[PDB]
């Protein structure tokens, strides 16, 4: 299955957001991250990807398609706007084994506030 996530300067949840900020997909599904506004990218957050997965980092302004392989929870950020809280979470499959490890990862305050909300929206 294929999904879309947009990067915007302003959304319902405030400035510098991924929409949706929380998404559950199946193993093998693809998500395209699309900078609707210019100046954004997507990168995995350190400490917030499952075992067996490889980190990724897109270029500024490109539409970046990723096929998620290893099951678990992935935290993503926009590189320039991580400190402003521009983050999101993608859960791949049921019963993510690294859910408890990702809740403990360290992030700047505004990002953590939004990651905690996004993790709670997954019923986590
Ligand atoms: Cu950004």
From Swiss-Prot:
Keywords assigned by UniProt, alphabetized: Copper, Electron transport, Metal-binding, Periplasm, Signal, Transport
Residues given in the record as Cu cation binding sites: 40, 78, 81, 86
Chain ranges of the Plastocyanin-like domain: 5-93
Superkingdom of source: Bacteria
GO MF assignments: copper ion binding; electron transfer activity
Cofactor note: Binds 1 copper ion per subunit.
Localisation per UniProt entry: Periplasm
GO CC annotations on file: periplasmic space
Cofactor: Cu cation
Purpose of the protein: This soluble electron transfer copper protein is required for the inactivation of copper-containing nitrite reductase in the presence of oxygen.
Name used for this protein in its record: Pseudoazurin
Species for this entry: Achromobacter cycloclastes
């Amino acid at each position: 299955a294929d999904f879309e996530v947009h990067m915007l300067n302003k959304g319902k949840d405030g400035a510098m957001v991924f929409e949706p900020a929380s998404l559950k997909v199946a193993p093998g599904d693809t998500v395209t991250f699309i900078p609707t506004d210019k100046g954004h990218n997507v990168e995995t957050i350190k400490g917030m990807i499952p075992d067996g997965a490889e980190a990724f980092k897109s270029k500024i302004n490109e539409n970046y398609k990723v096929t998620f392989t290893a099951p678990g929870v992935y935290g993503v950020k926009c590189t320039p706007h991580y400190g402003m809280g521009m983050v999101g979470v993608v859960q791949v499959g049921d019963a993510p084994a690294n859910l408890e490890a990702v809740k403990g990862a360290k992030n700047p305050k505004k990002a953590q506030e939004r990651l905690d909300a996004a993790l709670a929206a997954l019923g986590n």
